[PDB]
């Protein structure tokens, strides 16, 4: 059976180098094309360019040429991608995808998982994890809210759960976003009765393995004058 | 390179719904045309290759049309596996051009944001940073409206959102906006508020706090 395995994610400073590669397992390596694709945080996809392993050719679309190098190793049937030296606006998903020769009738019905390139200033840093208490202003009926900032982490990403996974229903965790620091933040909200809070302990479990970095944290409600 | 135009970015539907989608070429591709899925954290699937032939296991609901400029993707009988992200790709000359997506959202009916406001917590605060945030929990449809609001003066740059996907059981939103000062200006001032406009609403709904007063 036909796949296309790529290499790990990969967390860079801007200016290093990077190689990610795609091996090709269940068909002769010769026989197709290799092509990588780009797609952005949020964004669509982007042919970058292609190999033939076959003839040793290589085809670019312009927007990338001489920014990026695709090769082969045909002895392993692996393709690669490569930045001399990356920006931070290399930041994103990339893909290789399997395709034909001029003339074919079929293009990219395999692809590869997919390997993310994270490019920034920033340094690896565990995140604060912050109670957001739940209140009166957090008291919608008898719906309560409360929840946990976690703040100034990098890279991503974080897991969060409630109560070590006790507590599921009602929980929204939100996107990261990336602050100017940065350095990214996000938060974990759940919503529980006003009635039982009162009765009940809610902590959230915060997980950055990337600095090695557990947290739980309680959150309890708060008084007001 | 032949500019793909793909419409709509955005489409809601219900289950059962009968959508189309149209991808316009600047350039004649004759039927050099393809179509994938994206479900999020996944590659891309093929559906339909050049011709509109429909890949093996496609289900019959997939289809495909068109020739020269104008091509349409036509999914009848929308099930609930069937929302997500399509593209369509032009594999007619280099570079290979990409359609920039449309996006499936199932249909429900308006629901109003329940809103929450977080005043900074007292360890944030013994660190010398102030995050308010501010929570619209389940609210249809997606467009709402945070303005923070500080001793009634309207805030602009201050502040960073975030929104949910669809909830798979009620297919609401969830929004967080946090408004971040330093600790100084955060003590400068007394009324923190948090203004939610949304069609759910007849008018907006202001949560507030002061500073100190827990
Ligand atoms: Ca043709
Ligand atoms: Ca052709």
């Known amino acids: 059976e036909v796949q296309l395995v790529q290499s790990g994610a990969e967390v860079k400073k801007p200016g290093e180098s990077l190689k990610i590669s795609c091996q090709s397992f269940?068909?002769?390596?010769?026989?197709?094309?290799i092509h990588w694709m780009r797609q952005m945080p949020g964004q669509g996809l982007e042919w970058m360019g292609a190999?033939?392993?076959?003839?040793?050719?290589?085809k670019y679309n312009e927007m990338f040429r001489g920014q990026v190098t695709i090769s082969a190793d045909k002895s392993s049937s692996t393709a690669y991608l490569q930045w001399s030296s990356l920006k931070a606006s290399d930041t994103a998903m990339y893909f290789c995808?399997?395709?034909?020769?001029?003339?074919?009738?079929?293009?990219?019905?395999?692809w590869g998982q997919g390997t993310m390139v994270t490019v920034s200033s920033a340094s690896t840093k565990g995140p604060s994890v912050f109670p957001l208490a739940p209140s009166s202003k957090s008291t919608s009926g008898g719906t309560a809210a409360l929840g946990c900032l976690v703040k100034d982490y990098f890279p991503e990403p974080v897991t969060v759960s409630w109560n070590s996974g006790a507590l599921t229903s009602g929980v929204h965790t939100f996107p990261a976003v990336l602050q100017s620091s940065g350095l990214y933040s996000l938060s974990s909200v759940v919503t529980v009765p006003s009635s039982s809070l009162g009765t009940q302990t809610y902590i959230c479990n915060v997980n950055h393995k990337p600095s090695n970095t557990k947290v739980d944290k309680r959150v309890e409600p708060k008084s007001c004058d | 390179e032949t500019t793909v135009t793909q419409s709509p970015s955005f489409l809601s539907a219900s289950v059962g719904d009968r959508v189309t989608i149209t991808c316009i070429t600047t350039?004649?591709?004759?039927?050099?045309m393809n179509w994938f899925q994206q479900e999020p954290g996944k590659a891309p699937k093929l559906l339909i290759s050049?011709?509109?032939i429909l890949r093996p296991g496609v289900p019959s609901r997939f289809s495909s049309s068109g020739y020269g400029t104008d091509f349409t993707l036509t999914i009848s009988k929308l099930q609930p596996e069937d929302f997500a992200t399509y593209y369509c790709?032009?594999?007619?000359?280099?570079?290979?051009?990409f359609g920039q997506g449309t996006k499936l959202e199932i249909k429900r009916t308006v629901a109003a944001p329940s809103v929450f406001i977080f005043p900074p917590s007292d360890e944030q605060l013994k660190s010398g940073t102030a995050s308010v945030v501010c929570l619209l929990n389940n609210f249809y449809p997606r467009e709402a409206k945070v303005q923070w609001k500080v001793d009634n003066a309207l805030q602009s740059g201050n502040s960073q959102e975030s929104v949910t996907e669809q909830d798979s059981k009620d297919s609401t939103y969830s929004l967080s906006s946090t408004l971040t000062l330093s600790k100084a200006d955060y003590e400068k001032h007394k009324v923190y508020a948090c203004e939610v406009t949304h069609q759910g609403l007849s008018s907006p709904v202001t949560k507030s706090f002061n500073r100190g007063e827990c």
């Open positions: 790709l032009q594999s007619d000359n280099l570079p290979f051009t």
């Open positions: 269940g068909y002769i390596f010769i026989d197709h094309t």
């Open positions: 050049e011709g509109n």
């Open positions: 995808a399997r395709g034909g020769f001029y003339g074919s009738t079929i293009w990219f019905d395999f």
């Open positions: 350039t004649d591709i004759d039927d050099d």
């Open positions: 190999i033939s392993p076959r003839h040793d050719i290589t």
